[PDB]
Structures are given as structure tokens and as C-alpha cells.
Design goal:
- There is one protein chain.
- The protein is of the alpha+beta class.
- It has 2 domains: 179 residues, 3-Layer(aba) Sandwich (D-Maltodextrin-Binding Protein, domain 2), CATH 3.40.190; 231 residues, D-Maltodextrin-Binding Protein, domain 2 (3-Layer(aba) Sandwich), CATH 3.40.190.10.
- The chain is built from 18 helices and 11 strands.
- The strands form 3 sheets. Strands 1, 2, 3, 6, 9, 10 and 11 form a 7-stranded mixed β-sheet that branches. A two-stranded antiparallel ribbon has the order 4-5.
- Helix 8 crosses helix 9.
- The longest helix is centred in the last third of the chain and has 19 residues.
- The radius of gyration is 22 Å and the shape is globular.
- It comes from Pectobacterium atrosepticum (strain SCRI 1043 / ATCC BAA-672) (Erwinia carotovora subsp. atroseptica).
- This is Periplasmic binding protein.
- One of its GO terms (cellular component) is periplasmic space.
- It is found in: Periplasm.
Length: 410
């Protein structure tokens, strides 16, 4: 028998479903051995990076899109999936989706699903506050004091998805705001630099300070009080004190996972500046499957990928555990069998994003650079612990961010 290895991360529901897909693949392809190598998200990238350095990586890897600079722009790259166009059925996938994973003409990975940032709100809490979901940034800021006065200091319109560990969500929210306002992105890849002027970086930090000062989100002192606990497991999320999250729609299942049975989470309006220049709609692949550059069995690896993403048996096995399938035929199947339905929060969030005006402002994978995100996070902590004024923190973020980007971007 021929043997292929596949790695991924996620929770136990994704693990079961991925195993179900593998078992169905093996039934259909009884001479192929599949070795499953899954794990949790923490440590996955560091393990994979070490494997790749030694030639020890699996034949098929789940990867994040924002890892392509490390592994492909500035590394050896993956097996070029255009070499398996027919097996993969690349013509089924949206061309725009495939373009996201191209590096210099070579397709580095196959998007499993596309995903967008959108608001998920706790209906019960907003209704108890007497505030409608906000359509403009004004309404968002104005909701904070109302929550505070009406429900108490524990209650907030919006949380921070990874607390004091990482504040990429609010960085991205700020980026969306700035794209609406100015029609530019945060990153200038050509210049290997932050695209915002010194003044615009100040405005970005000011936007954060406003969210905090207005009681829209809790500060970093609040989140630090919860330690290293997953925010999707802390009591204020579970019990509706934090009444919103700005999530990738591919994270909805995770954030829904520990909510009480009677809780009601809903997709919320796409907050926009009146007369915005751009929608600021923020989308990317939720994840990709890549084939090892030096796999001995790239055809069989591609067969497994096609089975998971396009074959009805693999598609049914995986359901929505990796988000809304990138292959529209796979989505149609899931709708036909009722897995995609109008009661489903992921489907609703995804469909809402799909109805928004397309952004003309590119999302850079470098906005998710881990050093950059940690610099942002620590900068917010400096502000929130009273260890710095906005301008100094902002200007220092700009210089440090630019040092990081000169290393990261090439």
C-alpha cells in the first residue's frame, strides 16, 4: 500500500469529521494508507516549521494563508498544485480564491473555505441594554456608555477575541475603519513598511483608546485578569457580559461551542463610515491544504484533498467544520441536505459578508505577522496600564513595526 501523512489543527468536532473523511477516502481508495497527524493550534506552526526545516513534514498540511510569506515567498515553497489541476478540479474553485495562494505563478495551497471578519452579537444583552446593533462607528461608540449605565460596568458591546494574548481582531477592526476612511491598507509591501503616515498610526491608536474610553470594549487590564484562559471559555463571554465579537466567520463554531443552550448569537451589520470610500470588507482563506514540496506521492495527496473538498462523501463528512466550502458545488450539496440552512449562524454570517460591496483595498498577509501583532498588543498594554501617551506609543509602534517588516517582507 502507498502511505501519505496529513496534518491539521482544531477541536474535537473537526478532528472527528476529518477522520470520517479519511475513512471514507480509504473505503474509496483501499490501497492508500493515510496517517493522521492532528493537534491543537498552539504549537502547530512551530512544529511544522521545524519539520519543514528537516524534510520531515507531512504530505498534506493544513496551513494558514498568512504563513505563505514564511514558507513560500521567503522559503522553498510547497508542491505546485497547478501540477495536479485535473485531480484537484481547480476549475471548480473561484478564481479569486486560487489567486490568494499563488506565489510567482505556482499555486502553494488550495483554500478550504473563504472567510470574512464580521460582528457576532449576543442578542439578549443588546436587547437588555435597549440598543440596536450599530450601523456606523458613531452608533458603536455611543452604545458603550449606554451598556455601562443601563446594565453595569461588567457589560460591554464588544469583547477582544484573544484577550491579552493577541489583539489582532481590534487591529483588523481599526484597519477596516481606516480603509473606509482613506481607501488605503495598513501595509506597503513594495516599501516593506507601514503604509499609514505617522499621523494615521496615531489615529489608529486613538481609535483603540476611544473604544476603551467609550466602554465599547474592555481594556487589557480586564483581559489580563483572566490569565491564559481561552476567551471563548471565560464567564463574561459565556454569560453575555461581553456582547459581541469581531470574528472570522470560520471561528464562529469555536466561539459558539461553550455558549448556554438558550443563548442567542446573531450576525450584525457591517459597521461603516457614512460616505465611505471603501467597504473595508476583510476576507481571506480560512486555511489551505498544501502538499509537501518533496512528497513521494503528490498525486495521492491531491486525491485526498479532492476527496475532502469536492467528493460528496468527503464533503458530507467534513460538513461545516472548516467553514463554508470554497467549492460552490460542495456548498450546494450541504444546502441540499440541510447542513447549510438559514438557522445556521456561520451560513448567515458568510451570506451577509457575500452581500457586502467588494473591497478594493488589499489585505496583506503581513498584517498578521506574529511579531507585528505582539508589538501592537504590547503597545495597547502600555496605554492601558498608564505607561505611555498615545503619540509616543504610536510613533514607537511605527518604527518597531517598520523594523519587523524589513525583515519579514522581501
Amino acid at each position: 500500500m502507498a502511505e501519505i501523512r496529513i496534518s491539521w489543527w482544531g477541536g474535537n468536532q473537526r478532528h472527528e469529521a476529518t477522520l470520517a473523511a479519511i475513512n471514507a477516502f480509504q473505503k474509496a481508495n483501499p490501497t492508500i494508507t493515510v496517517k493522521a497527524e492532528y493537534a491543537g493550534w498552539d504549537g502547530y506552526l512551530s512544529r511544522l516549521s521545524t519539520q519543514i526545516a528537516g524534510g520531515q513534514e507531512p504530505d498534506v498540511m493544513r496551513i494558514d494563508w498568512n504563513w505563505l510569506p514564511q514558507f513560500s515567498r521567503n522559503g522553498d515553497g510547497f508542491y505546485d498544485l497547478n501540477k495536479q489541476k485535473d485531480i484537484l478540479g481547480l476549475g471548480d474553485f473561484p478564481p479569486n480564491a486560487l489567486k490568494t495562494a499563488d506565489v510567482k505563478g505556482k499555486l502553494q495551497g488550495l483554500p478550504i473555505s473563504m472567510t470574512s471578519r464580521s460582528m457576532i452579537y449576543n442578542k439578549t444583552t443588546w436587547d437588555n441594554a435597549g440598543v440596536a446593533y450599530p450601523k456606523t462607528w458613531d452608533e458603536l461608540f455611543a452604545a458603550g456608555p449606554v451598556f455601562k449605565q443601563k446594565l453595569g460596568d461588567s457589560y460591554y458591546p464588544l469583547g477582544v477575541a484573544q484577550g491579552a494574548s493577541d489583539v489582532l481582531d481590534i487591529l483588523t477592526l481599526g484597519r477596516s475603519y481606516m480603509a473606509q476612511k482613506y481607501g488605503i491598507d495598513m501595509i506597503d509591501e513594495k516599501k516593506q513598511s507601514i503604509a499609514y503616515s505617522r499621523d494615521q498610526v496615531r489615529e489608529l491608536f486613538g481609535f483603540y483608546k476611544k473604544l476603551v474610553d467609550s466602554h465599547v470594549i474592555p481594556d487589557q487590564r480586564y483581559f489580563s485578569s483572566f490569565g491564559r484562559t481561552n476567551v471563548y471559555e471565560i464567564r463574561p463571554w459565556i454569560n453575555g457580559e461581553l456582547a459581541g465579537m469581531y470574528l472570522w466567520d470560520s471561528a464562529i463554531y469555536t466561539y459558539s461551542s461553550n455558549m448556554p443552550k438558550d443563548a442567542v448569537l446573531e450576525t450584525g451589520p457591517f459597521i461603516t463610515i457614512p460616505g465611505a470610500k471603501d467597504s473595508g470588507l476583510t476576507s481571506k482563506p480560512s486555511s489551505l491544504f498544501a502538499i509537501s514540496k518533496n512528497s513521494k506521492h503528490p498525486k495521492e495527496a491531491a486525491m485526498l484533498m479532492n476527496f475532502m473538498l469536492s467528493n460528496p462523501e468527503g464533503v458530507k463528512a467534513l460538513g461545516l467544520q472548516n467553514g463554508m466550502p470554497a467549492n460552490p458545488k460542495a456548498q450546494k450539496l450541504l444546502e441540499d441536505i440541510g447542513v447549510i440552512n438559514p438557522g445556521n449562524l456561520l451560513a448567515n454570517a458568510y451570506r451577509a459578508a457575500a452581500a457586502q460591496p467588494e473591497s478594493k483595498v488589499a489585505v496583506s498577509p503581513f498584517m498578521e505577522n506574529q511579531e507585528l501583532v505582539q508589538l501592537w498588543t504590547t503597545s495597547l498594554q502600555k496605554l492601558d496600564y498608564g505607561n505611555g501617551e498615545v503619540n509616543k506609543v504610536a510613533d514607537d509602534f511605527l518604527s518597531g513595526a517598520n523594523r519587523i517588516l524589513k525583515r519579514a517582507i522581501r
